From a paper:
The X-ray crystal structure of tungstate-bound rTub was determined at 1.85 Å resolution. It consists predominantly of β-strands (59.1%), where the C-terminal half of the β1, β2, and β3 form a three-stranded antiparallel β-sheet. The Tub dimer is formed by another three-stranded antiparallel β-sheet consisting of N-terminal half of β1, β4, and the β5′ from the neighboring monomer. There is also a short α-helix between β3 and β4 and a 310-helical segment between β4 and β5. Tub has eight tungstate binding sites, where two (type-1) lie at opposite poles of the hexamer with a cavity that is open to the surface. The overall structure of the type-1 binding site is similar to that of the molybdate binding protein, ModG. The six type-2 binding sites in Tub are located at the interface of two adjacent monomers by non-crystallographic twofold symmetry producing two binding sites for every dimer. This binding site is very similar to that found in Mop and ModE.
Here, we characterized E. limosum Tub, a tungsten storage protein. Tub has a sub-nanomolar affinity for tungstate and contains a single TOBE domain first characterized in a molybdate storage protein. Crystal structures revealed Tub assembles as a hexamer composed of a trimer of dimers, capable of binding eight tungstate oxyanions at two distinct binding sites located at inter-subunit interfaces. Tub enables E. limosum to accumulate W and then supplies W for two tungstoenzymes needed for conversion of lactate to SCFAs.
Author numbering:
A (entry chain D), C (entry chain F), F (entry chain B): 1 to 69
B (entry chain C), E (entry chain A): 1 to 70
D (entry chain E): 1 to 71
Amino acid sequence: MKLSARNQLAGKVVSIKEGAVNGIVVLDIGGGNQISSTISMDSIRELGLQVGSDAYAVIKATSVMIGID
Amino acid sequence: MKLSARNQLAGKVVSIKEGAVNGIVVLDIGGGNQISSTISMDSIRELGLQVGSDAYAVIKATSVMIGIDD
Amino acid sequence: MKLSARNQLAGKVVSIKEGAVNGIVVLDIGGGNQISSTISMDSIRELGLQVGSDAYAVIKATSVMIGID
Amino acid sequence: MKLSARNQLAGKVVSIKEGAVNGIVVLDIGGGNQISSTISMDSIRELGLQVGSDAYAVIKATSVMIGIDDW
Amino acid sequence: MKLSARNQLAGKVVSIKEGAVNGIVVLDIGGGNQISSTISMDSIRELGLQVGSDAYAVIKATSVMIGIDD
Amino acid sequence: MKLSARNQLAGKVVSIKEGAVNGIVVLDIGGGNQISSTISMDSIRELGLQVGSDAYAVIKATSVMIGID
């Protein structure tokens, strides 16, 4: 599928924290940056994610805030 | 403040699209990646954002989905 | 791409209201249900959406509340 | 209460997966579609939800993305 | 309707900024605190919101971040 | 950091329910209102949250719905 979400950042899975109904996936997206994603365990299983998998961090623009020092 | 949001990514403002009550800020966070943020125009003014400003893209972990190739 | 979002509902575009930076797309997903989506105008153009387009309403499970009478 | 959320879709609870502080509720909203919801266990209990309960999937318009096949 | 959203804060409408497809509603919830809401212009009209209207700010718990000083 | 989030509500922590990857923090912001926040356990620990902590409820404007009687 092609998605409206303005942010679709390729990266490699660095870690997966398995929980009860959710888990947290950490992706290395390059440039020294990592992104953490809290999603359903069903989705982690259905996408076959494991440490080392290639994936994307997907974020709708209305979910992104801006901060300054 | 220090925020619980797991994602706080430093970058430089590449463009700002001004709208009616919202605008869209694009940040270059390095590594060839950019992040687009849709926030209120009031916040854009109050934070003093301009093209070239140093800023952060801040994203709660529960807002991030994972994708894989087809 | 394939997405973790638990909700990916097929439907056809019934209307698009254009704004300044955002627009509102209404999708008929059948069975008398319609979904309204508020997204960037850039995405609306990039996905080539028009009245009648086939599309999907995509919703992260953590964005769905449950209500009762 | 009347809510601003543009999406308020009636359906029946088909399943509830209990987690630690959250659970996942699945609603059959008709037309062969289901909606899955991740909400607090406290709310699942307070709303008295069970398999067979009548409910609504409530989604703010700004939370809905659009996808296409792109073929 | 009854909603699972764990946050439902009564207040009075102090201001409405109209936009193109969205507007921004500000509620006085008391104690010197205000809540700003970015919602569709359709909802603002359909709910009959005006300066002075009694209303509620409704927020899903997964939408709330926690911050601290320093 | 300074954040674009239009809602930054001072309060004191009255409860913490720990989960597997998330926990739920309840902040009393005065006037008889309490705000519940579902965030990662990592964040709860990293912010040093305990009953009695001074903190802020931070909410993006696009996450706030309006309801009426």
